[PDB]
Amino acid sequence: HMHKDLHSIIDALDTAGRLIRVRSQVKAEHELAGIAAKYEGCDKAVLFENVDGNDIPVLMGLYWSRDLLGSLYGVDAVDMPRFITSKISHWKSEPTAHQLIAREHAPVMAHSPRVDLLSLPIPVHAQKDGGAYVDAGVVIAADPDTGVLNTSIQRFMVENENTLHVNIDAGRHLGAYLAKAKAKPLSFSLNIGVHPGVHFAAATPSEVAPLDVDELGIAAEFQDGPVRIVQGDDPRVTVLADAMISLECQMYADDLADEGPFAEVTGYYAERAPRPRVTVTAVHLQRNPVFHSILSGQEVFNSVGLLGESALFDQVSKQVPGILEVALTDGGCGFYHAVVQLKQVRAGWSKQAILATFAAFPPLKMVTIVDEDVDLRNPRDVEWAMATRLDPERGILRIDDTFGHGLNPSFPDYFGSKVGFDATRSFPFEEKHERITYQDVDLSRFEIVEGH
Amino acid sequence: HMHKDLHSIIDALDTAGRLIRVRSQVKAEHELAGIAAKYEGCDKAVLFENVDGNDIPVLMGLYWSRDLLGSLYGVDAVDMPRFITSKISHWKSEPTAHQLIAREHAPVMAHSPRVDLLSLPIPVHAQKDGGAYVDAGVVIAADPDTGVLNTSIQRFMVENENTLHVNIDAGRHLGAYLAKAKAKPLSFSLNIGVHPGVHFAAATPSEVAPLDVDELGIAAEFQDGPVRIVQGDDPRVTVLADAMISLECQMYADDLADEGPFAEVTGYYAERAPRPRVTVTAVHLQRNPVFHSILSGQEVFNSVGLLGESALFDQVSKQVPGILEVALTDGGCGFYHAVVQLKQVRAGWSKQAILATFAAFPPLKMVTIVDEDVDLRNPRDVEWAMATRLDPERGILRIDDTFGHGLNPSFPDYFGSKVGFDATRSFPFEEKHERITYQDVDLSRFEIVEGH
Ligand SMILES: Cc1cc2c3c(c1C)C(C)(C)CC=[N+]3c1c([nH]c(=O)[nH]c1=O)N2C[C@H](O)[C@H](O)[C@H](O)COP(=O)(O)O
Ligand SMILES: Cc1cc2c3c(c1C)C(C)(C)CC=[N+]3c1c([nH]c(=O)[nH]c1=O)N2C[C@H](O)[C@H](O)[C@H](O)COP(=O)(O)O
Ligand SMILES: [Mn+2]
Ligand SMILES: [Mn+2]
Ligand code: NA
Ligand code: NA
């Protein structure tokens, strides 16, 4: 249950019968994403064997099911956030130095075609996206002053066969490395089709891996041995050796061009706007490369939840007794709604749980508290807790004029109202709140034919 | 797409591949319900071929999927509430008189064993239920003064081989017929394994079918020809001829015995308490009888929602422009949460929608309003509307000290607080609230191998 590269992942999923093979030709323009969309969240990913008759298949849906990600590393869905956090803790405490290797030993350096981005089966995802996007690509970039690596993930729109337009949010580390090159232009690699270890490194936030620190070793914790890197053709760039595809790239500051629209976590479109142009100097491919894309939605909600929930639980359970679990629900775009599950020990702690949760995760708009006997990850079950337990008069806590996330239109200019719901039963515990219960049953204990 | 009896239903489901056959022996005590519970809500019912080696199999889960009920009558899940209401309208306007038939022509009169309730595979459902229950049984009872029929559905607990304890809520028509016999004791039949038409007749509320009116003709609207009835052995009683099983029963007023606990719609237990004892005078069975039981949960939520939603929609759309649909959600126990979907035409109507909905359905605790582009029946999607569109400051409307449903512990003594959520986008419509969209795609148009 360790994985060197995406090949390992796909074979494991294929073997486990958690792969959906779409054998028919599909169009990279809208149709592919459309099919993905009908499967979003089920316990399998999707391999498109034939995209516009490309030799290169595309994989989508790797991140939309915690059960699937768990199966790849042998952990239950419920234990995955702790699993990942424990591994990031081990990296912080004893980092594994990368292994630099010779160009002709690096599987990704197998081929170097003349740069034609339109030869790649890059999907146009949502119906109003401003073009085809690579959105699963991990950017590795060296500090122009100190050579220290930074690993981030960023959406790149294809303009033409050799140009991308990239979105760099405010306070991103890639942003800061560009500021340094603009005191001299910034080279980097875009590594498409990486294993989850690289994905989690890329998505690890600033306060876990500061600017002056190399988060890529996080990936080493999810594979035997160290992360393999390789000198590019640049040579200011460093390439991920075990990537399916890797793009050597260069970008000048103060050189903007229209990119977007694209889907945001909110489920709304980004504004099309002038954002940095990046020019693709070279292309490297394994033999039998699969192109990896992410469908905006649960794939992103789970990326954020798996990395963020353990810290949040840690912060709330430290301030409040009897906390059991915290969910950054998919309904809330893995960012705007937290459900906190606790075992009450005294009246009043449920409200402290609301304060602690809102204080620990500034983007949150809603917090719901529920008891140990409610499934915090089932929105039906939280609705039920609201319907039978919430006191609308005393259990709704509203915070006005507070800081929040500006992408969410409930928070114009990073400013608005938050609300907590205390959907707990009354304490001390009373019979009138004791839930009915059906015997728990192993279905393998019986012969069951379900439809034919 | 018409059905004379339960046999018709089961064959149609079997043919349609919407039947789950559990072939292994299962225990009527807890185990059976436990298996049902793992399937609750999916697009199939469950036939248990072998319950404690009884010759009689049991059917469960007929009502937990509107898609399944729709498939039986050729209507989409979305059109089923209107379908049922239209048919009850036709019955109110032009009722079909019943067909009385000779004892030896009535399939249910095939056999009349010595009365042994413990020979029947009657499930003990929830782990703290006070015994085995028949809960899908339709009671037919004649007015002791006027002979006019009343059809209701009531939970009966088995005490011993010839005695049941029944729960009769306040203001039930069976209650009123008992008050009349107690001016002279009340006979009636308990008809188990009936088609949905009989179920909907039984569940049709007081204000649609008054005390002095015979609701059983409603069933005639869901079958070719009239409802077949037959003289019992009593002979103050009337039996449903096409039932799988029918129990001739007698009950004296002021003759109480401990019954319960049992699951209520809330998902909590009823208080065990002195409630009327009923004594089973005779038992009738088809050959090839199947015993029909209901799992407390979605089976009950859909019974209430399918009968109630059209009236509620009718009442709200009359007072407010742009109403499209109203859901009595399963999270709210088909009773405590209504989601109202509308197409906004002017600021302010969303709040009138909250007032109209609360006014039209007194049990409601929560109302949520959403726009045309949110799936009101998907709790994830309503959570999303809450996360991105609700203004917590101006969009939460709280009503205190109002009437509500006493079974819900948020409303002690039929008194408490209600709350409406206005999770609509801003009007006039703005780009920042336009949801991303993936192309709609027919999956039958492609070769897809899904796991193996
Ligand atoms: C998980 C994830 C994170 C995205 C992201 C996506 C995903 C799935 C996409 C691909 C679906 C859409 C695009 N994303 C962008 C993004 N940050 C950014 O500046 N621009 C982006 O366009 N991020 C966030 C960024 O990669 C993380 O916050 C890193 O932790 C930042 O790295 P750093 O701390 O080294 O700066
Ligand atoms: C759908 C449904 C309705 C139940 C019901 C259930 C279901 C599934 C069960 C079986 C799961 C639990 C028990 N139920 C009872 C009940 N009414 C009552 O007085 N006592 C009950 O125990 N009802 C409702 C009752 O039958 C309806 O209110 C009828 O409209 C009454 O007919 P009436 O208007 O002629 O009185
Ligand atoms: Mn960093
Ligand atoms: Mn009636
Ligand atoms: Na990072
Ligand atoms: Na009735």
Numbering used by the authors:
A (entry chain C), B (entry chain E): 1 to 184, 187 to 454
Paper text:
The UbiD decarboxylases are prevalent in microbes and reversibly decarboxylate (hetero)aromatic and unsaturated aliphatic acid compounds using the highly modified prenylated flavin mononucleotide (prFMN) cofactor. Here, we characterize I3C decarboxylase from Arthrobacter nicotianae (AnInD). We provide structural and biochemical insights into AnInD, revealing the enzyme to be strictly specific for indole-3-carboxylic acid (I3C). Structural insights from crystal structure determination combined with small-angle X-ray scattering (SAXS) measurements reveal the enzyme undergoes an open-closed transition as a consequence of prFMN domain motion, an event likely coupled to catalysis.
AnInD structure in complex with prFMN was solved by molecular replacement. The cofactor complex structure was obtained after soaking AnInD crystals with freeze-dried prFMN powder. The AnInD structure contains an entire hexamer in the asymmetric unit. Each monomer of AnInD is composed of an N-terminal prFMN-binding domain connected to the oligomerization domain via an alpha helical linker. The C-terminal extended loop projects out and forms interactions with the prFMN-binding domain of the adjacent monomer. Electron density of bound prFMN and associated metal ions could be readily observed in the active site of the AnInD–prFMN complex structure. The phosphate moiety of the prFMN is coordinated by two metal ions, identified as Mn2+ and Na+ as these were present in the sample and by analogy to other UbiD enzymes. The prFMN-modified isoalloxazine ring is placed adjacent to the conserved E(D)-R-E network of ionic residues that is conserved in the UbiD family. A potential hinge region located on a central alpha helix (G310) can be identified, which connects the prFMN-binding domain and oligomerization domain. The crystal structure of AnInD remains poised toward the open conformation as frequently observed for other UbiDs.
